[PDB]
């Protein structure tokens, strides 16, 4: 019955970092609800680095992709009554219609003490990425020394804290002194500003002269070439992301020295978080929520108010503004 | 006095965005002796501002020139109502002691907008003038390659080349720009973003090669043009706009084997090198050619000082057809 | 005792040249071993960087005992030793390795340096443990006519796998086609490597036994199946590099395809697993399932030329220097 | 009447990176008898030069390697070229050749007996002419400038520095070994450093001349030149002589120089080939070079390798920095 929505679309494909002129806000009228459908109003929307890469497959005019926490504000579906909170991925839009087959309810034990926006962060997709990347790909068992970059981001910050609660030494790389201070307060063994250190090689050597057992890699590029030169024999690399290339203008940087990869017999595996489904996934979500409640994973969010500022939140996150999960409060 | 000032909130990373600029308002001090209050009429945004901004401190005013009017005068040499060129930056009002100003040509007619003092009959036009006539040294009959050919500098380069008897091959970023320059009479114009092979397109435009390369773009584009320069060909290194917003390293240089065998001469320049009589002669020549119709002028005017960042960013993204001007 | 020794006069810059090597003679003062067959291997190009100028080049050899002060290593015994590029050496016996007890007279002793030696074990563990082939997979192997690659392809065939092989000459294409590899092509002459791999297997590749690295591997990665495994054995296209390494593969492809890539050194496997692999390799050669070809060069004084010829792709099979 | 034997180095395989021995092949052939107007030339000294690495790419496998030589007429049916005449000829890497005389060049009439004939391939030959015109016409030095020259201990660079010194210029030279540093310091170069061992190329150039560089005689290119460009004065001149850092490169070319520096500093950069200058201008420069050598203002040093059979090794060593001065092969 006459609903209106706003939608952020891709006006121009990104060249380097996105700029404001690459996005366009549009207003449309959604149709009335059919049988079994619901009207969803966004409460929190997420912006994520993968959107920079996936945008290349969109056509100009398409809606930007993304997930959101929404509530049902109108319902013709008995399973999804008015007021129900759900996870949905209609893209950058304030209102959408769903038949119920593309939604995901929150954990039944979701308490009132934690913001709903953590369903998009530590107790959501980024937290699951840290969980499986560190515990399954690296396979940490306790006592390892873990190198994690973008350590103050949504994924990296959870990687470090899970590593700490599992008995690991953590060396974290971040892009500002404010982020260094925050992670030092959390208790990370060594944290440094990769933008200001005189030599990345010497900083990593001093942080762990014996080398690194695991490398949770979010950045790639020249940074990873240096870390690879300090991996222990049989060292494991979880190839989570390569954000240093997402906004690159020229050709990719050189690859890591193969003589080091082979002599050290490194194991390097990339992964997508959606690989894990069913029981393993549900167990990981329950563990993440439990650790947040127990205080072993502290929660910090970088909230930006206003749907109209979503392009600016996406661009700021890519440029390192965010401390914790970047969230847009509708 | 009340004034608006655009400042650099954050150093650019890639293309500028709105969050990189901040509008500030200030109260200028009273006019002292020999000082005047200038209120902006037209402001210019230029690609060099993207590169020069790196030496500003966060909070500083963006640099730039403007055509301004005297609205208050305590200096007899600059009476109220005088039109001048000044470079206080992105600001609506400023105070000057008079020693850093430049009057317009004494014979400036009312039939041409004052904003061309920032364009074809100003700094961009002088850039095209000296780069083509003194660096390339065109005398008539040469084949000239010019990129960003629909911009402030490139469009003047092509038309001066045409009136000097040169063949002009121009590269632009949209089909609209292809049509405009073809209407002006450029011999060959193409859209570098859509052509299947830049190497093949340039080869057909001139199988004999290029005597001069007026380079506004740089990067991989120039590597290809260099591969088709005639022996002893001259390159005027005016700009390298394809690198101004780069995040990573510069692209490879041209193959030295071609540069050496072809014995190319490549000279960069800043327009302010030319002063005094040579410069004044060039300004008079540009004005004369505009009046005679040999240089048609097109402007990309954006109204509102508050849209000045948006004009800067639109220019960097190729929105402008002609000189980008902000009407105060 | 007196011996011949090839030493490193100058660190390599690009491909080695003769001026980078120097033939020396020394006076030796346990057992005395005289070399019968010596190996040259690509790893020597990289490992030479940690040698000091004047040091002996590293390497393995099949040798003969010509004098004995240890009854456990009596005169006439055939052994494997790694004194480097030298015709004679002194050893206390604790760093030696006898050949398989069931070594037949029908196979040359030089295969202890090849298919039934370190290169064969490299193919064995790289394909069966790292790739984990179980039968039915499509395996991409480059340098398929080399000591390691040729064994990789033949082990894959006897396990029921499709094999796509890359080589540097038409002669190597013909030999591997005779062996029965499903597809073999000359990577130096094909018009488009991407299309050659695409046509050779439009469905993609389950495993990649990588000996070459560089831009070649970037293209293969773009055609790996999801969860595909890569055995990072070698990167010979970079060993003689003068400038910087080429770009890596596009990370969006590596991540989306969730590839598992593990490098290995063959010496990781010891004890029972290694001895089992040696017995399997010897058995497979005798049954005819692994045919052996060797590129033998006569003369210890031509050992540098064998090393350099191997790096340039002259050799078909394991490069061996007969003393 | 009779027929002579000759040896010839050919290109067996195109170079990949630096050349290796297997890329060359020595062949022996029988030259035909001399016809009227022809001479038989025996090589005395042959030159190897960096350009051969690049030009070899257009040869077909089997072709003779290109190059110049000082040769002597050992048999003549040509009255203008009697027995014993010394000439420059470019038959390639070969010990003997037949010429009709139309592609030869006699030595200077005033060539003295006190200087080796091989200098006709070096300081008083093509490399010296390269330094001469690159520094005096392309850079246009007039006296008082500060000149940056790399490969400063090579055939061209060493002459560039010494001409710069006799014209009243400060010279900063870059070389690849400590032995080359010592030699050029003895010659009197103001500053000489080993670019392979210095901690920071940028800081070394800054200290060598805090005011910047008026001219850059560029033999190297690549990343080295990117750093030199960052310290050129306004209106600085660059003579693009060579780019040897790319000749044996395996991967893609290195990044270009920062355009913002090239433009802001209004640099003038011109490439040249030495053969542009012919006739009277060339003869005058040769006379100046010979005069300066005799007066001692240009000292000559040669890196001689004896044996035609070692010509590939001399070419490869020169590319790798073995040579101090002009690389020469004494037949
Ligand atoms: N399934 C998967 O494999 C999966 C899932 C989710 C995310 N990821 C990846 O994991 C990474 C983190 O994602 P997230 O959601 O946690 O984002 P995030 O870390 O919250 O934000 C991105 C951060 O990356 C850093 N960054 C940006 N450009 C950089 C550069 N050139 N070099 C170094 N650091 C740079 C910035 O922090 P600094 O100030 O520290 O630079 C920025 O804050 C991304 O690569 C993303 O694609 C992978
Ligand atoms: N040396 C001097 O004294 C001096 C003085 C003034 C200007 N300049 C230089 O001259 C050039 C033009 O200046 P202008 O004032 O006339 O600006 P303009 O051409 O009016 O505007 C810049 C134009 O460059 C083009 N462009 C942007 N990114 C590009 C890319 N990656 N590749 C190719 N073209 C691209 C766009 O047109 P398309 O649609 O063609 O992409 C855009 O319209 C700049 O390099 C500037 O720095 C030098
Ligand atoms: N422990 C280990 O992990 C281990 C042990 C042994 C060997 N390896 C590695 O496995 C590889 C094979 O060594 P090998 O002992 O079997 O000897 P090999 O295959 O005979 O190695 C030389 C061969 O490599 C090829 N090659 C050389 N340059 C190349 C290039 N740029 N691109 C492609 N192919 C090139 C040539 O054959 P084509 O021209 O036909 O390609 C040449 O015949 C090497 O990378 C070596 O380091 C690893
Ligand atoms: N345009 C012309 O007409 C013309 C004519 C002749 C020569 N040239 C050029 O001038 C240059 C010198 O030629 P030349 O006959 O005098 O040879 P040269 O300097 O006598 O010998 C070459 C020298 O270059 C140096 N070198 C090699 N690779 C290098 C690298 N990657 N980086 C830095 N230096 C490197 C080595 O000295 P270090 O140990 O100091 O590195 C080596 O000794 C070459 O670029 C050549 O192509 C041009
Ligand atoms: C790609 O850069 C290298 C460098 C050194 C290498 C290898 C590869 C390989 C593998 C190969 O590539 O063949 C080996 C075996 N390396 C050794 O030096 C070595 C020697 C003795 C022992 Cl016990 C273990 C290792
Ligand atoms: C940087 O790539 C090259 C390629 C070929 C070159 C040169 C440089 C130079 C300059 C140099 O670098 O020495 C020369 C002289 N080339 C010739 O092959 C040649 C030979 C004979 C004549 Cl008459 C003219 C040119
Ligand atoms: C590095 O280039 C990419 C490109 C696209 C990507 C990712 C990474 C990642 C991983 C990451 O980097 O976050 C994800 C998740 N991509 C998706 O577009 C996507 C979206 C929804 C689903 Cl259900 C599955 C995949
Ligand atoms: C490509 O990197 C740069 C960097 C700075 C530049 C320029 C180009 C150009 C040339 C151009 O690109 O337009 C100019 C004019 N720059 C200035 O900052 C400047 C400002 C005022 C004066 Cl008086 C003199 C110079
Ligand atoms: Cl599109
Ligand atoms: Cl570093
Ligand atoms: Cl270790
Ligand atoms: Cl906090
Ligand atoms: Cl900036
Ligand atoms: Cl600052
Ligand atoms: Cl093209
Ligand atoms: Cl020409
Ligand atoms: Cl005029
Ligand atoms: Cl070495
Ligand atoms: Cl050493
Ligand atoms: Cl291809
Ligand atoms: Cl697949
Ligand atoms: Cl997926
Ligand atoms: Cl003689
Ligand atoms: Cl050929
Ligand atoms: Cl440096
Ligand atoms: Cl200066
Ligand atoms: Cl190159
Ligand atoms: Cl001396």
């Amino acid at each position: 019955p006459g609903s209106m929505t706003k939608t952020w679309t891709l006006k121009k494909h990104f060249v380097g970092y996105p700029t404001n002129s690459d996005f366009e806000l549009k207003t449309s009228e959604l149709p009335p609800l059919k049988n079994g459908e619901v009207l969803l109003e966004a409460l929190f929307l997420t912006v994520d680095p993968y959107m920079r890469v996936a945008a290349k497959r969109l056509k100009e005019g398409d809606t930007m992709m993304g997930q959101q926490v929404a509530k049902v504000v109108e319902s013709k579906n008995v399973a999804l009554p008015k007021g129900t909170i759900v996870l949905a991925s209609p893209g950058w839009t304030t209102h959408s219609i769903s038949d119920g087959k593309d939604l995901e309810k929150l954990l039944t034990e979701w308490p009132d003490t934690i913001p709903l926006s953590l369903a998009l962060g530590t107790v959501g997709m980024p937290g699951l990425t840290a969980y499986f990347g560190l515990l399954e790909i690296c396979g940490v068992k306790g006592g390892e020394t873990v190198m994690v970059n973008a350590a103050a981001g949504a994924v990296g910050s959870v990687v470090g804290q899970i590593a700490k609660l599992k008995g690991c030494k953590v060396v974290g790389a971040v892009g500002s002194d404010e982020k260094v201070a925050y992670l030092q307060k959390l208790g990370f063994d060594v944290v440094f500003n990769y933008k200001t250190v005189e030599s990345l090689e010497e900083t990593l050597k001093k942080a762990s002269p014996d080398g690194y057992d695991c490398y949770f890699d979010n950045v790639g590029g020249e940074f990873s070439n240096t870390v690879i030169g300090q991996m222990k024999k049989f060292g494991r690399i979880a190839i989570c992301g390569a954000i240093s290339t997402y906004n690159r203008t020229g050709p990719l940087p050189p690859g890591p020295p193969p003589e080091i990869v082979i002599y050290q017999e490194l194991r390097m595996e990339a992964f997508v978080v959606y690989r894990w489904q069913g029981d393993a996934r549900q167990k990981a979500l329950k563990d993440l929520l439990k650790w947040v409640l127990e205080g072993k994973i502290q929660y910090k969010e970088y909230i930006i108010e206003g749907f109209e500022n979503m392009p600016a939140a996406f661009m700021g996150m890519l440029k390192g503004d965010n401390l914790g999960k970047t969230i847009v409060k509708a």
Side-chain angles (χ1 to χ4, degrees), chain A residues 1-184 186-330:
Chain A
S3 166
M4 296 300 290
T5 185
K6 292 174 179 290
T7 307
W8 277 111
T9 63
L10 180 77
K11 196 206 285 185
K12 270 294 190 187
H13 279 105
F14 306 136
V15 179
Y17 285 94
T19 179
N20 302 96
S21 67
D22 297 328
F23 306 84
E24 181 176 7
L25 185 65
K26 292 181 176 278
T27 301
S28 45
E29 185 176 4
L30 293 166
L33 292 182
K34 299 138 185 270
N35 278 119
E37 294 186 336
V38 297
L39 179 59
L40 303 174
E41 175 175 322
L43 302 173
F44 301 96
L45 305 95
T46 180
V47 296
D48 298 283
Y50 79 85
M51 298 172 182
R52 173 61 183 85
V53 180
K56 299 194 296 180
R57 283 136 174 272
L58 297 174
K59 325 309 301 182
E60 297 184 354
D62 288 356
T63 303
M64 287 295 296
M65 74 288 294
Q67 189 171 56
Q68 64 177 237
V69 178
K71 80 172 182 300
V72 179
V73 291
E74 184 185 345
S75 171
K76 288 182 176 172
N77 179 354
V78 304
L80 293 162
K82 184 173 177 179
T84 302
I85 307 301
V86 302
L87 288 168
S89 303
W92 300 17
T93 187
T94 58
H95 295 83
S96 55
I97 293 168
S98 171
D99 68 341
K101 307 181 185 67
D102 50 51
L103 305 182
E104 174 181 350
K105 292 202 225 297
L106 290 190
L107 291 171
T108 57
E109 67 265 23
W110 195 276
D112 288 357
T113 53
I114 72 177
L116 296 169
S117 43
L118 277 61
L120 305 169
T122 298
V123 191
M125 184 274 291
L128 293 170
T129 299
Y131 184 102
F132 290 112
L134 179 67
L135 303 179
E136 290 268 317
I137 306 301
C138 296
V140 297
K141 308 260 284 184
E144 292 91 5
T145 302
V146 177
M147 219 305 300
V148 58
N149 50 29
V155 173
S157 72
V158 175
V159 169
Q161 294 177 84
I162 295 178
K164 288 305 305 176
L165 72 88
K166 293 293 183 180
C168 303
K169 176 179 178 180
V170 173
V171 181
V174 297
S176 73
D177 296 338
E178 179 187 0
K179 297 176 179 191
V180 168
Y182 173 71
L183 297 180
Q184 284 170 340
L186 291 183
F188 290 10
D189 302 68
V190 184
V191 191
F192 64 91
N193 183 344
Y194 71 85
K195 292 180 178 177
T196 62
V197 295
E198 188 179 323
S199 171
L200 178 60
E201 184 183 330
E202 288 191 29
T203 302
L204 294 166
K205 187 77 185 187
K206 294 174 180 173
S208 185
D210 285 331
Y212 295 89
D213 297 291
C214 313
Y215 180 21
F216 197 108
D217 188 9
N218 290 310
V219 172
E222 294 289 6
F223 191 105
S224 296
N225 292 346
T226 307
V227 174
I228 285 168
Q230 299 184 34
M231 297 297 296
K232 293 185 188 178
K233 199 156 181 169
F234 309 119
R236 290 198 170 189
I237 302 179
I239 301 171
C240 180
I243 193 166
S244 68
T245 72
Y246 295 177
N247 304 278
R248 76 187 181 272
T249 54
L252 292 160
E259 63 263 22
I260 294 171
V261 174
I262 294 164
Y263 191 82
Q264 297 301 97
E265 313 189 52
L266 301 182
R267 184 186 178 281
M268 329 189 308
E269 180 176 355
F271 64 98
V272 179
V273 63
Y274 307 114
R275 183 204 299 194
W276 291 271
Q277 297 291 347
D279 291 332
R281 180 180 186 269
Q282 195 74 351
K283 214 278 181 174
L285 285 174
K286 292 177 186 286
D287 283 353
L288 292 160
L289 174 60
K290 191 189 73 169
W291 287 330
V292 172
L293 294 171
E294 297 174 345
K296 296 171 185 175
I297 297 175
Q298 302 197 54
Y299 116 87
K300 199 167 187 65
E301 283 181 308
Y302 190 75
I303 298 117
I304 288 164
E305 300 198 19
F307 179 82
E308 61 271 2
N309 300 309
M310 196 163 179
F314 177 54
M315 285 180 284
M317 172 270 292
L318 295 173
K319 289 182 188 183
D321 295 352
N322 63 306
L323 178 61
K325 182 70 190 84
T326 309
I327 297 293
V328 174
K329 186 180 193 301

